[PDB]
């Protein structure tokens, strides 16, 4: 049913990304060359975010921001909203696709509740953050280098590492990777066959796994929870910056040249990074 | 049978002409003109 509601939209998003990465330019939006046509490589190419000349206007094809023209519609940078919006629509379509597959089979939908994490990550990073910001010009670009630039910008302007939510998201991602590796390794070790692994972990790690369903639930739950908390933290950054800044240490270090903490040096890096772009 | 013959003929007419159409589109001054991408000479 809904399995045909995402295929056209996902294919259009993919086609838009492919068209942008090789033909359109970011000269009139960022003053940069961001496609294969100009001479960029795979890492450099990016579907750049729209310029800071319209604000939050979506740059529709039939909208007066381009007036039906295509060269203008590409130069204004409407391809970024096009790609992002179609991708989000297709992603929620796949959410409903997993939902309806689970409904048809008759088992509890757990692939959908797991896939919910990427949905939150996408809607928070690419949609809600620019909405909370001035305009799309500060939204992340659809590129390998654009993502890194956005990451560094958020570090400079928010100290995102010091945020509890990114910390717990890092913990969730690394725990998911560890659990994946350990489950695969133990399965190929005992290759039932659970008593051997349980004894091995009881004697090695002490706190062994009660059941394989428990371990499977834990590896299902750790990374999705980490992603959800990271998305919630980004959304908070849009509304209310949740960074616990120890101003006591800041004042203690400002006028004492014999005191310093790595938090103080992180603050130094952040403020110098702010001052670097005027 | 004849169906495979027509399949091969249809796939032989189109693929080379499509590749060459792309090559012509980007070789001449069409890719820059349509997509708004500036040519390297105009850059300031």
């Amino acid at each position: 049913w809904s399995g045909l509601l995402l295929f056209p939209c996902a294919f259009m998003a993919l086609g838009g990304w492919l068209t942008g990465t090789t033909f359109v330019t970011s000269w009139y939006t960022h003053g940069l060359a961001s496609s294969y046509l100009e001479g960029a490589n795979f890492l450099t190419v990016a579907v750049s975010s729209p310029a800071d000349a319209f604000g939050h206007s979506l740059l529709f094809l039939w909208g007066p921001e381009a007036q039906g023209n295509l060269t203008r519609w590409f130069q204004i940078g409407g391809l970024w909203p096009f790609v992002a919006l179609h991708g989000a629509f297709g992603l929620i379509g796949f959410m409903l696709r997993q939902f309806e597959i689970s409904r048809l089979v008759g088992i509890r939908p757990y692939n959908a509740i797991a896939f919910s994490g990427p949905i939150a990550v996408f809607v928070s990073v690419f949609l809600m953050y620019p909405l909370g910001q001035s305009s799309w010009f500060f939204a992340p670009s659809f590129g390998v280098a654009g993502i890194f630039r956005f990451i560094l910008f958020l570090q400079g302007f928010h100290n995102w590492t010091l945020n509890p939510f990114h910390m717990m998201g890092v913990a969730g991602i690394l725990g998911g990777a560890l659990l994946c590796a350990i489950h695969g390794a133990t399965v190929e070790n005992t290759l039932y066959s659970m008593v051997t692994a349980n004894r091995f972990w009881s004697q090695i790690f002490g706190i062994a796994f009660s059941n394989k369903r428990w371990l499977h639930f834990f590896m299902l739950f750790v990374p999705v929870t980490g992603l959800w908390m990271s998305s919630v933290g980004i959304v908070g950054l849009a509304l209310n910056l949740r960074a616990y800044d120890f101003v006591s240490q800041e004042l203690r270090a400002a006028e004492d040249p014999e005191f310093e903490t790595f938090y103080t040096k992180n603050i130094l890096l952040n403020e110098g990074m702010r001052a670097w772009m005027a | 049978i004849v169906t495979s013959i027509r399949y091969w003929v249809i796939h032989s007419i189109t693929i080379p002409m499509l590749f060459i159409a792309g090559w012509l589109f980007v070789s001449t001054g069409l890719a820059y003109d349509a997509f708004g991408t500036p040519r390297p000479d105009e850059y300031f």
Partner: peptide, 28 residues
């Protein structure tokens, strides 16, 4: 159908790869 499911991806990909192949030469 499968026909569209394959052609909608095939018919622009050859055009695009030919384009990139030519761009691999248009560079001065």
């Amino acid at each position: 159908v499968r026909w569209l499911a394959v052609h909608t991806l095939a018919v622009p990909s050859v055009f695009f790869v030919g384009a990139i192949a030519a761009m691999q030469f248009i560079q001065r």
